[PDB]
Amino acid sequence: ESWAQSRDEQNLLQQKRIWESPLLLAAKENNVQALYKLLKFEGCEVHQKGAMGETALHIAALYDNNEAAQVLMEAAPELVFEPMTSELYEGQTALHIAVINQNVNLVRALLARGASVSARATGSVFHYRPHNLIYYGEHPLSFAACVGSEEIVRLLIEHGADIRAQDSLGNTVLHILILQPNKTFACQMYNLLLSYDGGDHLKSLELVPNNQGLTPFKLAGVEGNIVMFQHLMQKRKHIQWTYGPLTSTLYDLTEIDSSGDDQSLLELIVTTKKREARQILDQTPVKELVSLKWKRYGRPYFCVLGAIYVLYIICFTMCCVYRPLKPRITNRTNPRDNTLLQQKLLQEAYVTPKDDLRLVGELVSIVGAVIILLVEIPDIFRLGVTRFPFHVIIVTYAFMVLVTMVMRLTNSDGEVVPMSFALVLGWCNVMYFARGFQMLGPFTIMIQKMIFGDLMRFCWLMAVVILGFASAFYIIFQTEDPDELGHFYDYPMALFSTFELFLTIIDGPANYDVDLPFMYSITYAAFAIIATLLMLNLLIAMMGDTHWRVAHERDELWRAQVVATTVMLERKLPRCLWPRSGICGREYGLGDRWFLRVEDRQD
Amino acid sequence: ESWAQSRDEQNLLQQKRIWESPLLLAAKENNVQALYKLLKFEGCEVHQKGAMGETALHIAALYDNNEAAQVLMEAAPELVFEPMTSELYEGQTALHIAVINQNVNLVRALLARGASVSARATGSVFHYRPHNLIYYGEHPLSFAACVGSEEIVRLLIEHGADIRAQDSLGNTVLHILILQPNKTFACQMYNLLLSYDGGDHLKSLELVPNNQGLTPFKLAGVEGNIVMFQHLMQKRKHIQWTYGPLTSTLYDLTEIDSSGDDQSLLELIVTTKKREARQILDQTPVKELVSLKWKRYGRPYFCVLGAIYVLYIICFTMCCVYRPLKPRITNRTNPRDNTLLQQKLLQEAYVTPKDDLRLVGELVSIVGAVIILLVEIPDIFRLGVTRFPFHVIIVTYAFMVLVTMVMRLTNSDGEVVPMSFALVLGWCNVMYFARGFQMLGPFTIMIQKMIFGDLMRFCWLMAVVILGFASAFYIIFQTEDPDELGHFYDYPMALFSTFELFLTIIDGPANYDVDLPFMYSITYAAFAIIATLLMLNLLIAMMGDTHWRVAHERDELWRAQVVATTVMLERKLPRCLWPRSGICGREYGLGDRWFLRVEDRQD
Fold first, then answer.
1. Do A572 and A589 share a domain, yes or no?
2. Where in the sequence is the domain holding B345, given as residue range(s)?
C-alpha cells in the first residue's frame, strides 16, 4: 500500500538528480567530452550522491557506458571501493551492475582495477520476495551464474570468487539456479559450477543446506524443477548391467526418503500447495519407490486398518440406537399440541440383560476416541495448526464422543445433539478409506475439490436468494393460518421451508380448498424459475470444473493421495511392522545406503 | 511379494562376486592385460561360478567385450559348451547373450568355435509372463529374429538353425514376432523367415499351432497385431480381375470362420478382454464377412426370435396377474393396524372358466424355462463359469419360474417374491434384443458399461452417506411419534426412507402442526446440500465416461455386439437353417475352401 508506491519516489528522485550535476547527465548518454569539461580542470570533488547512494561510476555502469567509466576508473579509482549506501540498494557495488548487464569489457576492467567479488548486495529490493521480480543472491558470482555470462563466471574464479558461498537465506548459487524458470541453459551451467569445485570438496558442495536446512536436490523437488532434478539424478544413478533393451539400474536412495525424521524428500513433497512439485512423482526413481512401498505392504495394511474402523463405527452405532429412555416422566403435553416427547434414563443403574452389553460396547467406543486424540496431537502441534481434508473430522468425531461422556454422569438434556453430529461425521469419516481403492478412488477427490472450492462459491449465491423469498413469503403468510396452509408459522421456519423448495424436495404450499393470496401465485412462480435456473447454472459451473480436470489432471491427484497416506503410515507407525525399503550396504559393501534396483526397457 | 524382491538378491550377488576373483573384474572392463596376468602362468583352473551359474565367458559376453572372449575362446574352449546353471537362467549359453547384444564379430567367432544353435534358454526369467519384461523363446534363432540382426539370422541358417522349432509354449518364432509391439521391422523380417523355409515344407510352417493349439494367423487376430494381420492376408488374397478403380478380389476364408467347432477366428475374437483385438474387425475381409452374414440371414432370424420372446413374457405376465386368491381366511387383523392382507388358493382344484386357460398358459411358461436351462448349460459349462452381460439373467429368470413351480404343489407363502424377481428380470431381459436395432443400439451399451463400472463405484459413495443420516435421524426421531411425523418408526425403515430422500423422490418429514426437533432442521438442511451435490458429482462422473467414449469408441462396440450375437447364433443353431457362407471348391475347383469375393474401389 504505502510501501511499493514509495519505490516509485526514489526512482524519480534518481532521475530528478540526474538533471542536476550534469556529469551524471553526461554519464547517462556516455558524453565524455563534457566529462573532460567537468573533471580535467575542475579536479577534486566528484563523490556525488543521489537516490540510492549511487555514484557517477554506478550510473555510468547503469547503462553500458564503457568509455565514461574508463575515464572514471582513471579519474576516481575509489568509486569501485564504495557500494551503494541505501536501504533498497545496500552493498551493491558497480560490479553487480556490470556483471548483470553482460559488459565483459567493463567487468574485466573493473577486476583489473580490482573489485571485491565477495560483496553482498543486501538491499531490500534484492531480498527473496514474491513481489520482487528477481532474486540472484548476494555475491556477483551468483549474479554471474544466472544470466548466462559463463566468461565472467570463469573470470571471477580467476580472481577468487568462492563457489562455497552463502546468501542471507543460506543458499549457494546451486539453490538459486533452481529458482529460475529460465532453465534452458543453467543445466549446462550446472556442469560448469561443479567443474570449479573439483579441488577441495569436504562435502562436495551439494550437501549445503539453506537457512532453514534444505539441500538443493531436496529443494528442486520442492520447487518442482523437473530438468534440474534429472541432471541431479545422474550423480546417484548406478547402472548395473544392460541387456539389449533391458537396463538394470540401481539408485542410491539416500535422501529421497529418510523414513520419518522430518527431513525426507517424500515428506517434503506433500506438504506444499505448489502444483509443479507434484510432478516430481512422475520420475522413474520415485514412482517405482512409492509403488513397491505401497503395493507390497502399504495397501494391505491400509485396508486391514480400513476394516477395523468400520467395526468401530458400527459398535458406536448400535450403542447409540439403544439409549436408555424413560417413557415420559414430565407430566403431559402442557405446551399445547407441538410437544411430543419421550424421556431418557438419568441415574438408574445399568441393568444386566442386554444393557451392560450396551455399556461395555460404549466402553469399546469411548476408548477409541481418546486413542485418536493421543495420536493426532502430534499431527496438529507438529505443524502449528495448518491443517486445511479428513484429519479435521477425526479430531471432531473424537470431540463429540467426549461430549457424550460429559453428558454421562451429569445427565444434561442435550446429548442427542453431539451424538447426532457424531454419526454423520463418523460415517463420513470412512470416506478416507476410499483413497486406496482403485475402482472409486479418483471420484473421491472430485467431491472434496468442490466442498471448499465450489460449494463455498455457491452458498453465498443461495443465501442471497433464500433470504428474499422466505422473507417475502413470510410477509404474505403473516396474515394467514398456520393450521391450514401452514408451511411456516413463524419466520425462521420459512427459511428452512424455502430451502426445502429451492432445492426442490418438497411440493410446496398448495391448499386447494381455500384461496391462496395472489402474491404467492406470482412470487412462487417467479421463485421456481430462479430456483430451476440457479440449479442449472451450478451444474454448468460443475462442467467447467471437470472438462479441464479430466484432461489427465485428476488421475495424478489420486496417485498423490496414495503417497501422502503412505508417508503418514510410514511416519506414525512403528519399526516392527514397517521395514526399511531398499537394500543397504551391509552384505554388499557398495555405499552403505539403502539401494533400489530399477530395470527398464527402451523401444 | 517375496519373489521379485529375491530377484534383486542374486543381481547384487552377481555384482558382489565380480569384485572377488578379479578375472571377472577384468572381464567387466575388458582388461586383457590382467587376463594375461591371471592365465598365462596361472594356467589350469578358470571354471568360475557366480550367481546364476555364469562363467567368465558369460560375463565377458555380458558386456560387448570381444577381445577378452577372444582370449577366453583360446584359453577355455569349453565355456561355450556349458550354459548357465540356475533357475532364473537355465540353459542360456553365452551365445544367447552374444546374439541379443548385436555383437556380430563375436557370434561369428562363437559359431567358428561352434555353439549349439538349438539350445533352450529355459530360465524362469525367460518364461512368457506379464511381469517379465521380454520373451523371445528358447533358441537363439528366436533371439536372432526379434532384435533386428538379420545377418545373424542368415548366419544361423548357415550353421543349421531349424526354422521348425518349438518353445515351452509350442510357439515357433512366427508366433513370437506377433508378440512384440516393435512391429516396424519384423514384417520385413517376416518375409525373411519364410525365405529360409522354402525347401521342405510339409505344412509350409504356418500351420504350426502353439501349446494350446493356436496357429499364428489366428494368434495375430487374438493379439490384435494389425500390421502382421495384413501381410498375412496377402497369402490368401486371390485377385479375380481389376476394372479401372474396381478390384474384384477373392479371399480363401479357410480359418477366419470355421462354423462352430471351437477353433474359429471369429469365435477367437470375441472371447477376450483385449481391446486391440476388437479392431481386427475393421479389416475388409472380415467386416465384409460379418455384414453379409448378418444382413442376409443374421438380422431377420434374430428379429423373428426377438418377437417370440416378447410373446413369451406377456404370456408369463398375464398368468402372473391372474393368481388364485382366497379372500382372507386368516381370521382378522389380529396384529394391530398394519396387517392388511388377502389370501391365496392352496389346493382347490383349477375350475374351468378362465382358470384352466390360466393353467395352460402357465404350462406355456413353465416349459419355456426348462428349454433355456437345457440350452444354456452348454453356455456355462463350455467355459467354466467365466460369464461376466445378459446370459447371467436368462439363467436367473429361468430359476425364478422353477421356484414358483416349487411353490406350486407345496403351497408355501413366499411365491410372490420369486415371481416379483421374475418380472423385473423377464422384462429387462428383452433389452438383449436392442443389440441388433440400429436406431437405439449403441445407447444400450452405455447402460451396461455404467452398471458394473460406474454404479459400483457410486454405491459405496451412497452407502457411506446414507448410513450416517438415516442413523442420525433415527436418534432424533427415536423420542418421537410414529403416528404424527412417522417417516420411520424403526431403524431399517429410516435407511429406506433416507434413500427415498437422497434420490430426491419423496418430500420428506414436514408436519407443520407440530414442532420438529431443531436438529432435524439442521441435519436435513445439511443433508440436502450433500444429496444435491453427490447427485451432480455423479453426473459429472458420467461426463468423463462419455466425452472420451463418443470419440468413435462406442460405435465399434455396437458392431462387436452384432458379431458376438451372430457367432452364438452360428454356434447354437442347427445346420438346416444356417447355411455355410462363401463358395466352396465344388463346381469351381480352385482350392476346395469356401471363398468370398470382395469388389473394391480406389480413389
1. no
2. 284-580
